[PDB]
Amino acid sequence: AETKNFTDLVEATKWGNSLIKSAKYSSKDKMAIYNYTKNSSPINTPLRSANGDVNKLSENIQEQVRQLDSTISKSVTPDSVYVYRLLNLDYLSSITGFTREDLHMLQQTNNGQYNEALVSKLNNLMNSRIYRENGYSSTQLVSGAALAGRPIELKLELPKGTKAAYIDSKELTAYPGQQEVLLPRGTEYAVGSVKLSDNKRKIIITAVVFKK
């Protein structure tokens, strides 16, 4: 079978539920997922501040991280699939070579459309490079199901069998309807390209995730 790319919410929900069923979540699993979706800053900020080094975190946070790591690893993708991580322009401050001025100019769109030259520069700066998200990665099975107004769309191809938690169920998330797929902390992805969306109103960063 070929890679999945969902545009229909019903099909996505059906596919996601299969992961939820295979997960066999306990009350402890449900609590970890829910609390993260509702208040994740206490966990991901310190993780980002010390790379993926859980050993530099306070005891309460290390326990919650080990717990959530364990919950997410309880299910894997049954098919190769694309998930979308919508991001703001601040994300680009982490890219080497893109100057403070490039961003300044980048925010100056032409009726919403982004500068093609600066996007090409991003492509040049990011292509074939492996990036790593130190916090957990909150994504959506269907692009636009959440925060659809954001500038950047990180299109991530997930290999079949990689750890991932589909959590769009009323008991798992404080924000139902975002078709959220939560990826392991430390997710690594090799950027294939950086281009303007079809309508040039978003910057699409396409990458392939390394099976986790």
Ligand X SMILES: NC(=O)c1ccc[n+]([C@@H]2O[C@H](COP(=O)([O-])OP(=O)(O)OC[C@H]3O[C@@H](n4cnc5c(N)ncnc54)[C@H](O)[C@@H]3O)[C@@H](O)[C@H]2O)c1
List interacting residues with ligand X (CB under 6 A).
37, 40, 44, 85-88, 90-91, 94, 133, 135, 138-140, 146-147, 175, 178, 180
Closest to ligand X by CB, 23 or 205: 205
Annotated binding residue 88: yes
State yes or no: 90 annotated in a binding site: yes
Q: Answer yes or no: is 140 a known binding residue.
A: yes
For the CB of residue 150, give the shortest distance to ligand X in the complex, in Å.
7
Is residue 86 a known part of a binding site? yes
- The annotation status of 53 as a binding-site residue, yes or no, is no
- Do residues 183 and 155 lie in contact, with contact meaning Cβ atoms separated by under 8 Å? no
- How far is it, in rounded angstroms, from Cα 40 to Cα 45? 8
**Shortest spacing between CB 141 and ligand X, in angstroms:** 9
How far is residue 206's CA from residue 88's CA, in Å, rounded to a whole number?
16
| 61 within 8 A of 43, measured Cβ to Cβ | yes
Element (H, E) at 140: strand 137-140
Between residues 2 and 93, which has the closer beta carbon with respect to ligand X? 93
Least spacing, CB of residue 155 vs ligand X, in Å: 11
Question: How far is it, in rounded angstroms, from Cα 93 to Cα 6?
Answer: 30
Residue positions annotated with a catalytic role: 85, 138, 180
CB 183 within 8 A of CB 139: yes
From residue 27, give the alpha-carbon distance in Å to each of 24, 30, 32. Answer: 10, 5, 9
Q: Which is nearer to ligand X, 70 or 88 (CB)?
A: 88
Amino acid at 96: T
What CA–CA distance (Å, rounded) separates 163 from 75? Answer: 6
Q: How crowded is residue 158: how many other Cβ atoms within 10 Å of its Cβ? A: 27
Q: Minimum Å distance from CB 154 to ligand X?
A: 8
Q: Which residues are annotated as a binding site for NAD(+)?
A: 37, 48, 85-86, 88, 90, 133, 140, 150, 180
